[PDB]
Design a protein around this ligand. Sequence first.
Ligand SMILES: CO[C@@H]1[C@@H](n2cc(-c3cc(F)c(F)c(F)c3)nn2)[C@@H](O)[C@@H](CO)O[C@H]1C(=O)N(c1cc(Cl)cc(Cl)c1)[C@H]1CC[C@@H]1O
Length: 137
Amino acid sequence: LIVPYNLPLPGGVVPRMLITILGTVKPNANRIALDFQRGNDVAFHFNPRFNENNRRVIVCNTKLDNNWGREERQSVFPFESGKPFKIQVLVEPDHFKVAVNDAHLLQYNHRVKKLNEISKLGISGDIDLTSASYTMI
Ligand SMILES: CO[C@@H]1[C@@H](n2cc(-c3cc(F)c(F)c(F)c3)nn2)[C@@H](O)[C@@H](CO)O[C@H]1C(=O)N(c1cc(Cl)cc(Cl)c1)[C@H]1CC[C@@H]1O
């Protein structure tokens, strides 16, 4: 698929919804972003950074009224330049749970409460996107 890519989430998200993003990281990747949006608000921004002060970090945040909130950062970094990945975002009642390549990575508590209005997933950055889909577990 072509990046950037928008995946509609009609009627938003619900607990037990498993969103699977498959792709390959580009060989000289700098950044990747998943943006779960409620209109212009970003309920959940998931942002692997490959070279922030010569380190790799996962930055997560929410954007409300076009303002970024308090970042939640994780140094566990499962992505590798040039390699195929699977990001799974499992919607739970109180958080998003992220697993990469079938290993738990992080949880992000719901700041945006209206899950049934989080109706788009934006996928951007330094990937070849293979597929973006969801199922109910
Ligand atoms: C560059 O801005 C990022 C935010 N971001 C990333 C992308 C993005 C990522 C992709 F992978 C991608 F492919 C793409 F197309 C677009 N779009 N927006 C977004 O990642 C946001 C997450 O908090 O961080 C922003 C940030 O870099 N800072 C920022 C942070 C806070 Cl809280 C407040 C403020 Cl005003 C700026 C830093 C300056 C000093 C701050 O530490």
